[PDB]
Scaffold this active site. Structure first.
Site: not given
Ligand code: AJ9
Ligand code: AJ9
Ligand code: 9YU
Ligand code: NAG
Ligand code: NAG
Ligand code: NAG
Lengths: 535, 537
Positions: B441, B328, B203
Site C-alpha cells: 500500500h 493493498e 489512502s
C-alpha cells in the site's frame, strides 16, 4: 434342447435363450422370478422370496415393467422414449435377468449387478441401453439386472406402520442380491466377487446398500454413476414421507389410523395412484421426486450424510463419476425458457426464477447467494452464460457436489475410491447441442452398444466403448480399473482427499485432473447448509 | 528587498511571501513552503472549523516546511525505512495549517493546470512535507503547479459530537476545503490556472478527494479528481454519527473528562499528547485497517452515507482516475494479525488465517466470517501456509480498497462520469519491506511524483523511464481529463472504464496492457452478497 441353455436354480429349472452379439453368441436368461408378485394385499409390503415351480420355466423374454409414470413431455422423441417402459406395465414385475458367455463360463466369473435409475419413479431392466450381451460376450462377464418397484408401489411409506414401512423398492433390490448369492454359481458366476453398478437413482441405491449392513454381506464393490445416497433428492425424512403419503391418500379418496388408510389405498387401481404421484411435492421444482427411500431408522439407521460421516469403509472399493452436463436434461421439465427445440437463451430474470425451481428449498438469501456465485460478472447478462449457469446450478446441486462429498468422505474413512468425469457426447445423440453431455448418456457406452454396427456409431466410439468396458470389468475383477496388461504411462490414480485426483473419460487418452468442482462444491457442501440453517 | 531573487517574491491575499529556488535534476523550480492558510486551530479553537488566516505584515519567509499536525508516531519497527519514511519530519504541533506550492522557475507564462495533493495516513497521521510528496519533479519536468496542504488528523481533525457547536466533526475535511479556496483566490499569483484544478491523493487522501466530490460546497473548487487506493465508500473511511459520538465520549472518559459543551471544554484543557496517547483505545474491536477518528456522516458536509451518494448522484461532468496497487493488504497484517512479521516469511496456519479474518473483517458475524474463509480458501491446498498468507493479504486488501474502488468506478461510470482505472504492479527496486508483501500500500506514490529521477536515489534506468510515463499520465489527465498523450498514438491507448467492458490498465515496466474485470467475481461477494448476509445475521 440346448444344454448350455438349461439351468437349475433353487426354485426349479430355467430355459435360457441364445443371443448373437457382434463377436459371438451369449446365453441370456430373461424374466426369472425372484419374489412373489407384490399384488393385492402385498402392495407396499416387503417382498417375499419366490415359491418353487414345476417343470422348466421359460426364461427367454423380458417380463413386465413395474407399474410407473410414463413420460409424455416430447411424445415420440427418441431422446425421451428410450427411457419409457418397453414392456407392459404391471405391479407383478419382480423379475431379474442374467447374461452369460456362451458356453457358460468354465471358471467362476465375477458378477456385475446393474441397478437402473429413473428417479425412483420409473425405469426397467429391459431397456435397450441396459443390454447385457456386449459385456458378457467381450469381457466374459456374468451380468445381472433386476426390476424393482418404483413410485408409490416401491416407496410410499407410513413410517412405523406395519402395512407400509417404506423402502420396499430397496428391499426388492436386496432380495435380488440375495438371489444372486444363492443361484449365480449355477450360471458360472462367482458369488464371492459381486460388483454393483447403477446410474442416477440406481447409483443412489447402490450407495444405500453401502450404508445398510444387511446389504453389505451381498456385494464386494460398487460403482455410482451420476447419483448418491446423500444429496437433496435421494431420500426424505420420516415426517415428509408421512406427509406425502397422507396427501396422496386424500387425493384418491382415502380414507373415506394407518391400517385404515393403507387398506383403502390397496383398493385403488394402480393408475389412480400414478395420476397423483406428482401433486404431493411441497414446492414447484425439478430434480425432486415424490416417492424415494425414506430415513426409516431401519434400512437407513440415520441420514445418508450422517452415515457416510461416521461409517468405516476400509475394505470397500468404489468407482464414482459424473457426466459433463448433469443438469441440462432437467431444465426442459419446468424451468421457463428452456426447450429441446430452441437454443434456450434466457434473460437474467428467467435465471433467477429458474434458481428457485432448481433449489426449491432455498431461502430468499440462499437463492441470492446461488445467483451471485454462478453469475459471470464480466457478462452478467449474456444469455448463453445464463442458460449454461442454469444447467450447472442444477447439476452441481444434485449430482456433482453430492458425488464430490461422498468421494471425499469415503476416501477419508478407509475406502479405495476412483473418480471420473465423462466428457464424450454421442454422435447419435438426439437432444440439442446446448445440452452438451446430458444426464445418463454415458450408459450406452459402458454397456458396449457402439459395438453393434447397425447402431451407426463411429469407429472412434467403438474403440472408446471397449476402453470403458475394460475399466468397468477390470474394476469388478480387481477393485482397480487399470489394465494389468497396459503398461503405458497414464494410470488412473485413486481419488484422495489430499490430491483429489480424477480422470477425464473421452476420445483422448486418460487425462488426470485435480479437484472435482472444488471451489463451487465448497459453496454447496460447506457454506450453503450453514446459510439455510441460520434462516 | 533589493538584493534578493526577484523571481521568488509573490503577494497573496494575506501578504507578501519569499520563496526558494530548488534544484531538480533537470533544472531549478520555485518553491513556496509553509504558507499559512488558516488561523492556528489552537486553544479554544481545538476541534473547531478553520478560519481564514489573518493578513500579516512584512515578507513572510516561505523557504522551509512548517509544523506537522499533531499525531501518533509509528514505532512497530524503530529506525526501519519502510515505516520512518511515513513518520513526521517536522515538529509536531496543533499550529499546523500551512500549505506548499511548487512551480517552474521562472514562474510560468500561461495559466498552468494545477495539481493539489491530499496525503493519506488513515486520517490519524500524515504530512505534506514528506520526501515522497516532493513537488519539484512534477513542477520541473511537466511544468505543473503543485500544491499540498496539511490538514488536522486524529482527534484534532475528526473527533465529533455530532450536532454540537464546539465539535461538529469533519473539521479536517474543512481544513482541506479552505486550502482549495485559497488556491481559487491566490494560485493565479504563481502562474497557476484556478480554472483547471485536479485533486489527487492516496489512502485516506484518496477518500478525502472522494468526499469533496460528494460535498456540494467543495465541488465548485476543482474540476477533476484522482483517487489512488482509497474511496469515500467502504468500511473504514467514515463512521455514523452514533459511532463518532460514542468514540468521542469514550476518549473523553479515558482522559478524565468529565452536556457536550462542558465535555468538549474539558478535552480542550488536555495536552495534545494525552489525546494521541489514547486515540487507539476507542476502537470497538480488535482490528487492522480501522481508525478511531475519521470523517463522520453529519448530514452537513456529508448529506448522507457515501454509498447512498454515489448510488444516486449526477456525475456526467466528472472525470476521475482511480486505481490500486497489486498488494493493498499486505502492509497491514504485521500491525495486528498474529503470525505476520516483516522479518520472516509469515507462512501461517489455517487456524491463524481464521483468527486473522476476524481481525481484518472486524464487523463480520460468525457466518459472514465463515463465508470469507470459504471464498478465499484454496480447496486444492487448504492448509498451504503460503496460500493462507497470501489469502490473508487478499482479504484485507480486497475488503478495504480493491472492492470499494471497484464499486466506486462502476457507480461513477453508470452515472455519467468519465473514468479511467489502473492496477499498479511494479515493486520499487529500492523497497525495504520483504518480498512476500509484493507491491505494498502506498508504494506507487514515489513513482507518480518522479523520485526515480533523483540520481542519488539509486533507482534503475527503467524505473526512471517508468516514472516519466506515470508523470505523463497524471499530468495529461490534469490538463485534459485524459491520461493519453494527444500526439503519441504509437503507444497503446488507455480506454475508459465502463460497465459494459470493465476495462482497466496495468502500470508496470512493460507497455500499457488492457484488462477487463476489476476482480469482478470476488468483489461481487464483497459488494453484493456480504451486505445482505450481514443484514440478516
Ligand atoms: C424428470 C422430471 C420430471 C419428469 C418432472 C415432472 C413434473 C414436475 O413437476 C417436475 C419434474 O421434474 C423432473 O426433474
Ligand atoms: C496502520 C495501523 C496501525 C498503526 C494500528 C495501530 C494500533 C491498532 O490497534 C491497529 C492499527 O492498525 C493499523 O492498521
Ligand atoms: C471464488 O470462489 C468462491 C468459493 O466459494 C466458497 C463459498 O463461499 C462463498 C459464499 O458466498 C456466496 C458467494 O457469493 C457470490 C459471489 O461469489 C462468486 C464466487 O464464484 C466462484 C466460482 O468459482
Ligand atoms: C423455447 O420454446 C418454448 C416452447 O416452445 C418457449 O416457451 C420458450 O420461450 C422458447 N425459448 C425462448 C428463449 O424463447
Ligand atoms: C514471524 O515472527 C513473528 C514475531 O516474531 C511470530 O509471531 C511469527 O510466528 C513468525 N512467523 C514465522 C512464519 O516464522
Ligand atoms: C546509493 O548507493 C550508494 C553506494 O551503493 C550508497 O552509499 C548510498 O547511501 C545509496 N543511497 C540510497 C538512497 O540508497
Amino acid at each position: 434342447e440346448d444344454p448350455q441353455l438349461l439351468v437349475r436354480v433353487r426354485g426349479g429349472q430355467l430355459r435360457g435363450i441364445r443371443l448373437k452379439a457382434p463377436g459371438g453368441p451369449v446365453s441370456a436368461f430373461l424374466g426369472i422370478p425372484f419374489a412373489e408378485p407384490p399384488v393385492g394385499s402385498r402392495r407396499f409390503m416387503p417382498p417375499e422370496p419366490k415359491r418353487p415351480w414345476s417343470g422348466v420355466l421359460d426364461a427367454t423374454t423380458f417380463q413386465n415393467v413395474c407399474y410407473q409414470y410414463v413420460d409424455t413431455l416430447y411424445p415420440g422423441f427418441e431422446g425421451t422414449e428410450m427411457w419409457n417402459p418397453n414392456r407392459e406395465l404391471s405391479e407383478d414385475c419382480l423379475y431379474l435377468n442374467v447374461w452369460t458367455p456362451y458356453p457358460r463360463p468354465a471358471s467362476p466369473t465375477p458378477v456385475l449387478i446393474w441397478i437402473y435409475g429413473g428417479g425412483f419413479y420409473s425405469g426397467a431392466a429391459s431397456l435397450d441401453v441396459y443390454d447385457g450381451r456386449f459385456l458378457a460376450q467381450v469381457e466374459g462377464a456374468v451380468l445381472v439386472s433386476m426390476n424393482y418397484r418404483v413410485g408409490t408401489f416401491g416407496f410410499l411409506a407410513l413410517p412405523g406402520s406395519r402395512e407400509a414401512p417404506g423402502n420396499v423398492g430397496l428391499l426388492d433390490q436386496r432380495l435380488a442380491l440375495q438371489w444372486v448369492q444363492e443361484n449365480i454359481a449355477a450360471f458360472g458366476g462367482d458369488p464371492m466377487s459381486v460388483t454393483l453398478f447403477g446410474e442416477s437413482a440406481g447409483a443412489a441405491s447402490v450407495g444405500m446398500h453401502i450404508l445398510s449392513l444387511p446389504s453389505r454381506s451381498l456385494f464386494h464393490r460398487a460403482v455410482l454413476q451420476s447419483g448418491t445416497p446423500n444429496g437433496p433428492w435421494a431420500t426424505v425424512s420420516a415426517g415428509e414421507a408421512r406427509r406425502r403419503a397422507t396427501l396422496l391418500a386424500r387425493l384418491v379418496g382415502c380414507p373415506p389410523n394407518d391400517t385404515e388408510l393403507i387398506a383403502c389405498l390397496r383398493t385403488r387401481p394402480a393408475q389412480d395412484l400414478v395420476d397423483h404421484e406428482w401433486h404431493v411435492l411441497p414446492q414447484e421444482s425439478i430434480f425432486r421426486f415424490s416417492f424415494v427411500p425414506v430415513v426409516d431408522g431401519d434400512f437407513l439407521s440415520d441420514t445418508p450424510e450422517a452415515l457416510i460421516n461416521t461409517g468405516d469403509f476400509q475394505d470397500l472399493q468404489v468407482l464414482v463419476g459424473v457426466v459433463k452436463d448433469e443438469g441440462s436434461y432437467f431444465l426442459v421439465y419446468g424451468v421457463p425458457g428452456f426447450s429441446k427445440d430452441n437454443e434456450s437463451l434466457i434473460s437474467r430474470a428467467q435465471f433467477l426464477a429458474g434458481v428457485r425451481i432448481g433449489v426449491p428449498q432455498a431461502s430468499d438469501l440462499a437463492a441470492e447467494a446461488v445467483v451471485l456465485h454462478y453469475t459471470d460478472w464480466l457478462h452478467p447478462e449474456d444469455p448463453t452464460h445464463l442458460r449454461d449457469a442454469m444447467s450447472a446450478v442444477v447439476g452441481d446441486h444434485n449430482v456433482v457436489c453430492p458425488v464430490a462429498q461422498l468421494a471425499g468422505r469415503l476416501a477419508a474413512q478407509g475406502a479405495r475410491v476412483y473418480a471420473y468425469i465423462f466428457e464424450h457426447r454421442a454422435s447419435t445423440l438426439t437432444w440439442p447441442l446446448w445440452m452438451g453431455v446430458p444426464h445418463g448418456y454415458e450408459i450406452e457406452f459402458i454397456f458396449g452398444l457402439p459395438l453393434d454396427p447397425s447402431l451407426n456409431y463411429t469407429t472412434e466410439e467403438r474403440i472408446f466403448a471397449q476402453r470403458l468396458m475394460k475399466y468397468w470389468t477390470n474394476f469388478a475383477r480387481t477393485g482397480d480399473p487399470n489394465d494389468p496388461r497396459d503398461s503405458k504411462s497414464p494410470q488412473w490414480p485413486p481419488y484422495t482427499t489430499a490430491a483429489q485426483q480424477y480422470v477425464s473419460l473421452n476420445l483422448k487418452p486418460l487425462e488426470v485432473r485435480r479437484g472435482l468442482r472444488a471451489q463451487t462444491c465448497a459453496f454447496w457442501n460447506r457454506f450453503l447448509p450453514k446459510l439455510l440453517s441460520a434462516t
